[PDB]
Design a protein around this nucleic acid. Structure first.
Ligand SMILES: [Mg+2]
Ligand SMILES: [Mg+2]
Ligand SMILES: [Mg+2]
Ligand SMILES: [Mg+2]
Ligand SMILES: [Mg+2]
Ligand SMILES: [Mg+2]
Ligand SMILES: [Mg+2]
Ligand SMILES: [Mg+2]
Length: 1310
RNA sequence: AUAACUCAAUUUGUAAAAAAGUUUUAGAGCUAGAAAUAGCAAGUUAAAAUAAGGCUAGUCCGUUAUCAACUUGAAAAAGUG
DNA sequence: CAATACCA
DNA sequence: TGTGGTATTG
DNA sequence: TTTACAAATTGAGTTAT
């Protein structure tokens, strides 16, 4: 009797019920509650709206951060624990004074001076050590016995802020020396061509505070006859951390583009050295050394002969220079600009020095402020020099201290420990403990150190001790934990669910892939009548001769190196492989290079061992654990080989198990899968064939060896945003089926709808750096500017034309074109992957295809450079160069066209599967499923084109009806489509020369609706005779449906979750709005939080005390229960409310009111709950469809439409009138309405297009939900808010089911 | 439609870490003047907190997902036009 | 208790 | 961006 | 801000059920 239409979105689900003749039914539904109404008429069409479902990222970030905080605190605790006794002998209350430092003097239990406990000693301390780094340096260098408190302070300061762990090994803090060394190995390599390094200050040039490239050019500038692109130049550039290509230096064909910071460098250099010889290893090693020394050089900036604390010395340098320069600046301003002195050094709100030190001004803002002040005056040259160096008036605690490795803090810590252990025995006994406190780090592959109460943890205990940094290796089972880290995420073999999957780089797996690809190769020569398979002997010969001697195997190598040299063929045609084999034996060659024993690798006896080794290399990444794991094989190799093996690492997992590949044997033959791959008589059967062959036993054994709705939907792949929509639409369908008397629909039609700046700037920076371009230095940008498409494309194309080979102009982007690589008539692609910036799109070649062969030939190399620089992707490149591969065939065109109407997205298929499996649950006499309900999926293009062809226009900003209308149209068009063409069920319905034909077929699939293109008035199906569409009266029905005033729009009521409030930590203030950051921290003294989020409101009817005498007065109001207060209120609401001050609370009248709670008042006017103290607009403006269509036409053959617009331009005043009466009845914002009427009367002189486009903006005044601002023409209209929820307390509350068809209304007159 | 492999791109989920920022306190302000108020000297650092907190007491957990109303029911869930 | 600006 | 909390203004 | 890891998914290709 009926079908269902569905439109699934990220913030909405549209639904509709249709009958046989495309009508939507209307029904009487019962109304519950305490009001007048017993029932209500409802149309069976509507839409559910909801806030976006969120990902789990933020929660994760905060969680991990939390853990870091508690662990840091623990570190400090360990330290103090060690210091306890001996500190008790010296100062009874030192640690207590430390821990209560935050407290106001009034609340302190001890003296207000932290370190010593009296004014004179404290002032003395600060006088001697103005910063902590002074004390650090003192304690590192001096030999005197020191106060235990200062020792503690230094150690604790080093431990609390320890630095990163991005560098492995030990650091011992130079550049001149290693530079001389590089020159040495260079000149000792190139005797005929020497370099003169005399008078060259390598230290000042390389450690200079400049960009790496500039410094490179500075160094090269001191070398005559030497250029930056030369070998030595590339070595220095390697040391500066650029991306040099040593190809041109060594006449290579393979580009030696090698970056030092890149993780693959250590293998890139082996790959390169294997080509030019091993004499050159010295050189590159020296280069790396110099690179390290340079890195240490941006960090330290102080001679290592003065002290063993270069870092602290550097901070002290910052201090001294800040002092001197501050004195200088003060004097200068005193002399020359005496009127600006107060502004600069006294006002915190002005970004001067005062705002820099005492205000919220950053170093960048401060530098911005004094730049023209320094420029305007005289004697401020070097100050400007330091300003451009970002080295002017530096603080010591700065944003750029993230460079500091933990090894140097560790260096100072160790030095201090060694220094003072000569006086304090406990420092001697606890040196390594403290060092480990700074050093220890929980491995990422271990996870939280939990004991059964963490859903995130996986680590296994080797003993039931409390875990400390010092007993970690003995208590934690590192191996089992590291293994569990991987195995809890990896797949099992689908075919054998109890078997683990092999490593992707396993030798056996690669043998499998190579043989599987090899088995389906065929060849023909002159003498043979038909192409033949490769035999077992041939396959083995090819493997041994080609696959075991070459990294990759090409077709040419197959022909020449095999078919010519062995089979004696001068010519042969091959069909199994393209250009070169996809599979290869990479691990075989890796291990061949490492262990240097082909016979060992070829011996079948060593199979298990090699598999275990590769497994170890894959499963782990820790070199120590890898080493311990490989110990059982230490007797088989030399120590050198053992270390090389240690360095070798792999990642990634296969798809099949070892038991599937080479374990299970066929009962009759006794052969495994791999055995069949290597030899199978005449029929070289595939893995797919072996697995499905009824004459073998594999299929038998495999078939032998073989989640609620919410969980199922949650486990799908996709954004949680769309998943929310999926669950919601399932629930909607359930309710609709319930409404229809528990009868199932005939059909269900579903349609599914289709920061970054940082990533963009990153892409462009790395790309340009790879390209070695200067365009970034010549044309500097900001990430916010890259939001512009043409500019982003400009930088991605290195400021060149993508079709012509010429430079473009940044200032002329408005004259250029953005062309689509594959025409948008075929591929609806809006991404950068299908877009390109060119001067004129006519230069692309033909507009009917991929860019011409001419262009491809002209630009291929440039595109290659862009590819290697990651400025374009592989897909973009392949699309750009398709013309040399025959361009777009007709098959491709037909395919694209059919893809424009046939959904292929996996997630939608999952939706259809869920619905289908929920509806059809019965099987027939042949044990086959009975499909009572047909689930159809369409793309949005069908309904969109339908609306555009018969003028059922959509304007989103008028109201929310368009979702529901979309669902309806989905149902109609879908059912009609399959009723007309029952053959297309394979394409649209869930479950189990010609190119031109398919093209024209799919391109005119929707022609049966049209009356002329010339077709009959009544459209039926040829075989059945059943009428599918009546052009005379069905369009009328659709038009009546879209014109229906009442449509069930329901905003999902949701409890608010998340953070308690704004994170801002505010200063103290006299306001009850402030919230304590800790239990005893009175916010009037300490400041705290502000602006909490209400989880849900609550209706309270009770009494409150009034006046001095506390007279009980009856009240009725809304109380906002915050997220922080929720658990307490839910534990015992009465006690909570009474604690709030309420008395004699009517417990049974307590009503929970989440956000978006709906209330109705007088003239059909509605409000939604935005908070406990604010409301949202609750009504929908049902504008008559004539006005919607008129607006659509006016705001955007065409001449008939223009004539319609001009003949009906009086519609404007009518639309304004409708908006006006609606606003007067429901919105109640007279000031804004006056502004609107006035502004509209102002621009009544403007063209019709413009007036329509700006009338579009006016609907935000009447839109459902939260009020917002909008510009009519140039007049901004500020939002009017509903800052009181009082009127709601006497309105009628409305409880709605998911469709809004079931209602319970409560008159809040109590 | 499905399976294995090659190349690339995207998305989701988890763990271990760094540097800032903010807040209160501690870095004896000095003179003149009864008084607000002038004139000048100064500033770079540190401690502690970083969701209130919880029991399961761990070097653990605390911001995702999920949620009309009513009848029941501790609760989970069923039922109701 | 408006119009209303600023904030995260 | 959008939108609910807050102090200020009257 | 940095490091380490797994899984789908899309889409250009080779071979199959
Ligand atoms: Mg805490
Ligand atoms: Mg030179
Ligand atoms: Mg600071
Ligand atoms: Mg190939
Ligand atoms: Mg590994
Ligand atoms: Mg939530
Ligand atoms: Mg800080
Ligand atoms: Mg509801």
């Amino acid at each position: 009797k009926y079908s269902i239409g569905l439109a699934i979105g990220t913030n909405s689900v549209g639904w509709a019920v249709i009958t046989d003749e495309y009508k939507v039914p209307s029904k009487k539904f019962k109304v519950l509650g305490n009001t007048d109404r017993h029932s209500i008429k409802k149309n069976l069409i509507g839409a559910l709206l909801f806030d976006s479902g969120e990902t789990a990222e933020a929660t994760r970030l905060k969680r991990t951060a939390r853990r870091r905080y508690t662990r840091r605190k623990n570190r400090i605790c360990y330290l103090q624990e060690i210091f306890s006794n001996e500190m008790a002998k010296v100062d009874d209350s030192f640690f207590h004074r430390l821990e209560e430092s935050f407290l106001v003097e009034e609340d302190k239990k001890h003296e207000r001076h932290p370190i010593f406990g009296n004014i004179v000693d404290e002032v003395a301390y600060h006088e001697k050590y103005p910063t902590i780094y002074h004390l650090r340096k003192k304690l590192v260098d001096s030999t005197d016995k020191a106060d235990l408190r200062l020792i503690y302070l230094a150690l604790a300061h080093m431990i609390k802020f320890r630095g990163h762990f991005l560098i492995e090994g030990d650091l011992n803090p130079d550049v001149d020396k290693l530079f001389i060394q590089l020159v040495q190995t260079y000149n000792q390599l190139f005797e005929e061509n020497p370099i003169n390094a005399s008078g060259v200050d390598a230290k000042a040039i390389l450690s200079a505070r400049l960009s790496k490239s500039r410094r490179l050019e500075n160094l090269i500038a001191q070398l005559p006859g030497e250029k930056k692109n030369g070998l030595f130049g590339n070595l220095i550039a390697l040391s500066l951390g650029l991306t040099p290509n040593f190809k041109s230096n060594f006449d290579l064909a393979e580009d030696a583009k090698l970056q030092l910071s890149k993780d693959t460098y250590d293998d890139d250099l082996d790959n390169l050295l294997a080509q030019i010889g091993d004499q050159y290893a010295d050189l590159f090693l020296a280069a790396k050394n110099l690179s390290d020394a340079i890195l240490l050089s941006d960090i330290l900036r102080v001679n290592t002969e003065i002290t063993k604390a270069p870092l602290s010395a550097s901070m002290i340098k910052r201090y001294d220079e800040h002092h001197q320069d501050l004195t200088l600046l003060k004097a200068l301003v005193r002399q020359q600009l005496p009127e600006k002195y107060k502004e600069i050094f006294f006002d915190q709100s002005k970004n001067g020095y005062a705002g820099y030190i005492d205000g919220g001004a950053s170093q960048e803002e401060f530098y911005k402020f004094i730049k023209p002040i320094l420029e305007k005056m005289d004697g401020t040259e070097e100050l400007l020099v330091k300003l451009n160096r970002e080295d002017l008036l530096r603080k010591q605690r700065t944003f750029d201290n993230g460079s500091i490795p933990h090894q140097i803090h560790l260096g100072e810590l160790h030095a201090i420990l060694r220094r003072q252990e000569d006086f304090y025995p406990f420092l001697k006994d606890n040196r390594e403990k403290i060092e480990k406190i700074l050093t220890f780090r929980i491995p990422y592959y271990v996870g939280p150190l939990a004991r059964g109460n963490s859903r995130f943890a996986w680590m296994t205990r080797k003993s039931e001790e409390t875990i400390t940094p010092w007993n970690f290796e003995e208590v934690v089972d590192k191996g089992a934990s590291a293994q569990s880290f991987i195995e809890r995420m990896t797949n099992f073999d689908k075919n054998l669910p109890n078997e683990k999957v092999l490593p992707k780089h396993s030798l056996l797996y690669e043998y499998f892939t190579v043989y599987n690809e090899l088995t389906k190769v065929k060849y023909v020569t002159e003498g043979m009548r038909k192409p033949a398979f490769l035999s077992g002997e041939q396959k083995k010969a090819i493997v041994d001769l080609l696959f075991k001697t070459n990294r990759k195997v090409t077709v040419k190598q197959l022909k020449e190196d095999y078919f010519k040299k062995i089979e004696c063929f001068d010519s042969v045609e091959i069909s199994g492989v393209e250009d070169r084999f996809n599979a290869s034996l990479g691990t075989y060659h890796d291990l061949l290079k490492i262990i240097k024993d082909k016979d060992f690798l070829d011996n079948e006896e060593n199979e298990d061992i090699l598999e275990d080794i590769v497994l170890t290399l894959t499963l782990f990444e820790d070199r120590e654990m890898i080493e311990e794991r490989l110990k059982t094989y230490a007797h088989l190799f030399d120590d050198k080989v053992m270390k090389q093996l240690k360095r070798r690492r792999y990642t990634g997992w296969g798809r099949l198990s070892r038991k599937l590949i080479n374990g299970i044997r066929d009962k009759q033959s006794g052969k495994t899968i791999l055995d069949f791959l290597k030899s199978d008589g005449f029929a070289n059967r595939n893995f797919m064939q072996l697995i499905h062959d009824d004459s073998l036993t594999f299929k038998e054994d495999i078939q032998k060896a073989q989640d609620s709705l919410h969980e199922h939907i949650a486990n799908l792949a996709g954004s949680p945003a769309i998943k929310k929509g999926i669950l919601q639409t399932v629930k909607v369908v359930d309710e609709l089926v319930k409404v229809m008397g528990r009868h199932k629909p005939e059909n269900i039609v579903i349609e599914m709808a289709r920061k970054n700046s940082r990533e963009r700037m990153k892409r462009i920076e790395e790309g340009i750096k790879e390209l070695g371009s200067q365009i970034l230095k010549e044309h500097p940008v900001e990430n916010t500017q890259l939001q512009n498409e043409k500019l982003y494309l400009y930088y991605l194309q290195n400021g060149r034309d993508m079709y012509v080979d010429q430079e473009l102009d940044i200032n002329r982007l408005s004259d250029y074109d953005v062309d689509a690589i594959v025409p948008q008539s075929f591929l609806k692609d809006d991404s950068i992957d299908n877009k390109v910036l060119t001067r004129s799109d006519k230069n692309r070649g033909k507009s009917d295809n991929v860019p011409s062969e001419e262009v491809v030939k002209k630009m291929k190399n440039y595109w290659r450079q862009l590819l290697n620089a990651k400025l374009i992707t592989q897909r973009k490149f392949d699309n750009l160069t398709k013309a040399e591969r025959g361009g777009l065939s007709e098959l491709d065109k037909a395919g694209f066209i059919k893809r424009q109407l046939v959904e292929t997205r996996q997630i939608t298929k999952h939706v259809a599967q869920i619905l289908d499996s929920r509806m059809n649950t019965k099987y027939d006499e042949n044990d086959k499923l009975i499909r009572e309900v047909k689930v159809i999926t369409l793309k949005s293009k069908l309904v969109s084109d339908f609306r555009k062809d018969f003028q059922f226009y959509k304007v989103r900003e008028i109201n929310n009806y368009h979702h529901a209308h979309d669902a309806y149209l989905n149902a109609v068009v879908g059912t009609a489509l399959i009723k007309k063409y029952p053959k297309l069920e394979s394409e649209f319905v869930y479950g189990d020369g010609k190119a031109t034909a398919k093209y024209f077929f799919y391109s005119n699939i929707m022609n049966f609706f049209k009356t002329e293109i010339k077709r009959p008035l009544i459209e039926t199906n040829g075989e059945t005779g059943e009428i599918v569409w009546d052009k005379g009266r069905d369009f009328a029905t659709v038009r009546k449906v879209l014109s229906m005033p009442q449509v069930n729009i329901v905003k999902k009521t949701e409890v608010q979750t998340g953070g308690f409030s704004k994170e801002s930590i505010l200063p103290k203030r006299n306001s009850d709005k402030l919230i304590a950051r800790k239990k005893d921290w009175d916010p009037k003294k300490y400041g705290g939080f502000d602006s909490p989020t209400v989880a849900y409101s609550v209706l309270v009817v009770a009494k409150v005390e009034k006046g001095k005498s506390k007279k009980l007065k009856s009240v009725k109001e809304l109380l906002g229960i915050t997220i922080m207060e929720r658990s307490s209120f839910e534990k015992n609401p009465i006690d909570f409310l009474e604690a709030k001050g309420y008395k004699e609370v009517k417990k049974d009248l307590i009503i929970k009111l989440p956000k978006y709670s709906l209330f109705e008042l007088e003239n059909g006017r509605k409000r939604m709950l935005a908070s406990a103290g604010e409301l949202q607009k609750g009504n929908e403006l049902a504008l008559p469809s004539k006005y919607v269509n008129f607006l659509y036409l006016a705001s955007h053959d065409n001449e008939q439409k223009q004539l319609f617009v001009e003949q009906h331009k009086h519609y404007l005043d009518e639309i304004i009138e409708q908006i006006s009466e609606f606003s007067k009845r429901v919105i109640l914002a007279d000031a804004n309405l006056d502004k609107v009427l006035s502004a509209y009367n102002k621009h009544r002189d403007k063209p019709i297009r413009e007036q329509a486009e700006n009338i579009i903006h006016l609907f935000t005044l009447t839109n459902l939900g939260a009020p917002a601002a909008f510009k009519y023409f140039d007049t901004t209209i500020d939002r009017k808010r509903y800052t009181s929820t009082k009127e709601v307390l006497d309105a009628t509350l409305i409880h709605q089911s998911i469709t809004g068809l079931y209602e319970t209304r409560i008159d809040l007159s109590q």
